Ligand binder design. Structure first.
Ligand code: CL
Ligand code: CL
Ligand code: CL
Ligand code: K
Ligand code: MG
Ligand code: MG
Ligand code: MG
Ligand code: MG
Ligand code: MG
Ligand code: MG
Ligand code: MG
Ligand code: MG
Ligand code: MG
Ligand code: MG
Ligand code: MG
Ligand code: MG
Ligand code: MG
Ligand code: MG
Ligand code: MG
Ligand code: MG
Ligand code: NA
Ligand code: NA
Ligand code: NA
Ligand code: NA
Ligand code: NA
Ligand code: NA
Ligand code: NA
Ligand code: NA
Ligand code: NA
Ligand code: NA
Ligand code: NA
Ligand code: SR
Ligand code: SR
Ligand code: SR
Ligand code: SR
Ligand code: SR
Ligand code: SR
Ligand code: SR
Ligand code: SR
Ligand code: SR
Ligand code: SR
Lengths: 194, 237, 46, 119
RNA sequence: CGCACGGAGGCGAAGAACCACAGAUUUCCGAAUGAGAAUCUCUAACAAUUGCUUCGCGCAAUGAGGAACCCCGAGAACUGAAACAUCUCAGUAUCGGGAGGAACAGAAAACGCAACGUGAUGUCGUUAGUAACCGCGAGUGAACGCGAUACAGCCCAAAC
RNA sequence: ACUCGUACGGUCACUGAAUCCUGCCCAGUGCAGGUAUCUGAACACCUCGUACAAGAGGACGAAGGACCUGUCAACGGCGGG
RNA sequence: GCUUUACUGCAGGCUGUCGCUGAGGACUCUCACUCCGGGAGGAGGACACCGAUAGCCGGGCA
């Protein structure tokens, strides 16, 4: 039979319809008065969180992060530039808002490591994402056969190096064949052409 | 070219800033809950460096010593009242609803409880005209009919220090001293006396503007100089 | 000028560094103070 | 709050939790939202309980509309920890289900009838 | 009894010097962390941000460095085009953030010598200056496959 | 920033104490207001096209422009016959 | 370096449209949102702000 989780999933397929439409209209009023990074005891989307790797265990932290909507907040050139490089308005950043949210969360929690993240909506001027972070030093996580991989030294600052899920997708590593000639194994090895 | 003087202003550097550390008080109306039972005695009459007009030191019933925007005629010993049931005497502050029509008023609020925005300079006054349950029409010193909320507070009388504009500065030094107390860069060099690099009107073998002086509203900072969006120019016609 | 305790220790060291290479080092090495600093001709730190 | 369409009186809630306490010691109960949902879907649920202080509301949001199309009666409890203590847990419970009562079958039937009268 | 062959004197068969490994000591400033400060000072200190929590800094974490290498972001211009704007120089220089002894990648919603075929990923040789791009100008420029190197495949979420 | 400021303010410009004065021109350019009608992009909408899409056309029409008016102590002009 | 009705563009301003954004070719409301108020509460209000796009102006700048 269907899990209770499947109903949280089905509700979030259309966040502008049903009971969720009313819920988000209410919640966002409280969220807009909240900070940049807010630690929350329980995830707003349980199904998505558990699907991404969350466990109701010690050393597993969740945090909601708000990042602004739109393109790059770029300064106009202060010296000689050819027409192609004279733009300000139409320039967008190469990292998506989700990735920015994950980094801001990881900074607030210097000891923890980013496991994953998901969208929890947006209004007219900002986007909210909930980031699942893990304590690599807590023995509750060091003994977990499903999460102890994140404890390894090479997993230190994994978000800042693009090793996160949203990182790998934004780096164009999804496809294993056609189109990923300049993305795999890294953007930098391929001369930054990805 | 180089950024014009008006662009250097916005950066808010020392030269363009007001000597705030030398200013006395931010003359706002007192905060009452209701009941009106707030009155005070005028202790001293001081000079206000910010507006070149006098200001009155008042000591209230609840032990609060605050400087108030002095209307004409207010002296030491006089009792001023602030509130709804306040007496309709010069120097008292009450909402526009309680003040009778045809009475000269000053230090008028824009939104109720803001402390006063309009009619504050030397010798000016706002004129309360029409009453309603929704709107209080006040005629501001510029001649504009401002429709306001009757709950907006105001002080009865004209502002003190009237006729300041009547006497000439005579010499540059007198202007210098006044300007040192304000947030303004002085003296003023004409754009027409500058180089092309420094101003839109700069350059040339003789002094004259390079294009017409009437600039569009849509003009960007660096170009918006001369006669800003003028509906007309000149005296005649 | 007014010197601090640390500045005084540093000036003290610079004065000590200004002493000559002892007579015996010449005999031991069988035959030059490259850090000779004058108060007027040279300049110290700070 | 968004899933709550009726207020349950303090006295009715007392009756409901007392009935749940004797349902674990005699009959059978399901503890936790996932187990409550499968109880409604399989049809084995006699009476389902739902907490009102669930944050996020998503976890429990579906119980009212689901129980309506499966004919399963539901009642709201104000607190999460009270429902968990009643089910016999040290922790709280967002939802509980009485899968076939026991020596409370008469009381549960009255609670189901008292709720329908309260819309 | 250093560089360093002096004078005086001393140490060494109680086995010194010297070398290897291990340990002791290891001022002050320094990430610099009680607070301030041009290496000093003032009256108990994980400052700051975090996780756990006996909710007490009790237990932990972060910070900074390193020759370059590596990964994630920001991103010129001279120059070439015999001018120059797209293009080119070039995702180069330079900047911000971060890991390791190597990084990154990685067990197909792949390939598409179309097959009765291949079978995670890097990398090397080749495919090839080929396909593709381009004021279709100047220039730009892969991949599948193949020969090699080395080889290794697995864990969740959900159902119950 | 102006601003502990509020039109007797302060911003943006021109001229340059006082005294006597400061003529005529709004065609061009600038600014501003108006505007029946004309022109005026994209989204949505309608027609055609396409099992969809590209695309073609239509309807509506903002600011702006056309057009009209105001303005020279606004740029400036004040001749030939 | 500087100028402009040189070429080409880039900021900026104005304006339409989409999102935020809700209830009953002009209108009412309040619940988001904005501002004022210490607070109670008041003003405004699906506009404005902001994000996106389109047209116009655009030597302010390259
Ligand atoms: Cl991380
Ligand atoms: Cl003045
Ligand atoms: Cl093959
Ligand atoms: K170039
Ligand atoms: Mg590599
Ligand atoms: Mg004031
Ligand atoms: Mg000054
Ligand atoms: Mg001048
Ligand atoms: Mg000159
Ligand atoms: Mg210029
Ligand atoms: Mg002149
Ligand atoms: Mg002149
Ligand atoms: Mg000496
Ligand atoms: Mg210190
Ligand atoms: Mg060239
Ligand atoms: Mg050519
Ligand atoms: Mg290239
Ligand atoms: Mg291929
Ligand atoms: Mg405010
Ligand atoms: Mg130029
Ligand atoms: Na971190
Ligand atoms: Na690319
Ligand atoms: Na010296
Ligand atoms: Na040592
Ligand atoms: Na520490
Ligand atoms: Na502690
Ligand atoms: Na050339
Ligand atoms: Na040239
Ligand atoms: Na080209
Ligand atoms: Na004219
Ligand atoms: Na030059
Ligand atoms: Sr780190
Ligand atoms: Sr004020
Ligand atoms: Sr105030
Ligand atoms: Sr000129
Ligand atoms: Sr005239
Ligand atoms: Sr000297
Ligand atoms: Sr709990
Ligand atoms: Sr293999
Ligand atoms: Sr004169
Ligand atoms: Sr004209």
């Amino acid at each position: 039979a269907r899990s209770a989780y499947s109903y949280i999933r089905d509700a979030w397929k259309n966040p502008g319809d049903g009971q969720l439409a009313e819920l988000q209209w209410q919640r966002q009023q409280e969220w807009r008065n909240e900070g940049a990074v807010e630690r929350i005891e329980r995830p707003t989307r349980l199904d998505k969180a558990r699907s991404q790797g969350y466990k109701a265990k010690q050393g597993v932290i969740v945090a909601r992060v708000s990042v602004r909507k739109g393109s790059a907040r770029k300064r106009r050139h202060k010296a000689g530039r050819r027409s192609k490089r004279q733009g300000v308005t139409r320039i967008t950043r190469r990292k998506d808002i989700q990735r920015v949210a994950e980094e801001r969360a990881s900074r607030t929690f210097p000891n923890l490591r980013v496991l994953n993240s998901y969208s929890v909506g947006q209004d007219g001027r900002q986007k909210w994402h909930e980031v699942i972070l893990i304590d690599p030093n807590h023995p509750a996580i060091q003994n977990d056969d499903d999460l102890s991989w994140i404890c390894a030294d090479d997993q230190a600052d994994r978000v800042f190096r693009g090793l996160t899920g949203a990182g790998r997708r934004n780096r164009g590593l999804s496809g294993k064949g056609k189109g990923s000639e300049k993305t795999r194994p890294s953007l930098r090895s391929n001369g930054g052409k990805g | 070219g180089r950024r014009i003087q008006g662009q250097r202003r916005g950066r808010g550097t020392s030269t363009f800033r007001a000597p705030s550390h030398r200013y006395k008080a931010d003359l706002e109306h007192r905060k009452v809950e209701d009941g009106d039972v707030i009155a005070g005695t005028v202790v001293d009459i001081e000079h206000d460096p910010a507006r070149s007009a006098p200001v009155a030191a008042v000591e209230f019933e609840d032990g609060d010593r605050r400087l108030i925007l002095a209307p004409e005629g207010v002296g030491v010993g006089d009792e001023l009242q602030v509130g709804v049931s306040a007496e309709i005497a010069p120097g008292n502050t009450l909402p526009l609803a309680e003040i009778p029509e045809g009475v000269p008023v000053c230090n008028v609020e824009s939104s109720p409880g803001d402390g006063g925005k309009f009619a504050r300079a030397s010798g000016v006054n706002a004129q309360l005209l029409t009453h309603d349950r929704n709107v209080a029409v006040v005629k501001l010193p510029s001649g504009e009919m401002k429709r306001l909320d009757p709950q907006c507070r105001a002080t009865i009388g004209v502002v003190a220090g009237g006729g300041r504009t009547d006497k000439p500065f005579v010499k540059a030094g007198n202007k210098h001293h006044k300007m040192k107390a304000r947030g303004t860069k002085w003296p003023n060099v004409r754009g027409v006396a500058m180089n092309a690099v420094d101003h839109p009107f700069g350059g040339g073998g003789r002094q004259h503007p390079g294009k017409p002086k009437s600039i569009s509203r849509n003009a960007p900072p660096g170009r918006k100089v001369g006669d800003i969006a003028s509906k007309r120019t000149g005296r005649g016609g | 000028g007014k010197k601090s305790k640390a500045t005084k220790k540093r000036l003290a060291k610079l004065d000590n560094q200004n002493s000559r290479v002892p007579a015996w080092v010449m005999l031991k090495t069988d035959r030059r103070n490259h850090k000779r600093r004058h108060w007027r001709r040279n300049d110290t730190d700070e | 709050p968004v899933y709550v369409d009726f207020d349950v009186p303090a006295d009715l809630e007392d009756d409901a939790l007392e009935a749940l306490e004797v349902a674990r010691d005699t009959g059978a109960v399901k503890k936790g939202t996932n187990e409550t949902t499968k109880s409604i879907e399989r049809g084995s649920a006699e009476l389902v309980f739902v907490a009102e202080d669930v944050q996020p509301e998503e976890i429990v949001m579906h119980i009212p509309e689901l129980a309506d199309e499966k004919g399963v009666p539901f009642i709201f409890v104000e607190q999460q920890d009270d429902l968990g203590h009643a089910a016999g847990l040290e922790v709280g419970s967002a939802a509980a289900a009485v899968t076939d009562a026991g020596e409370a079958d008469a009381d549960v039937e009255d609670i189901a009838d008292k709720v329908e009268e309260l819309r």
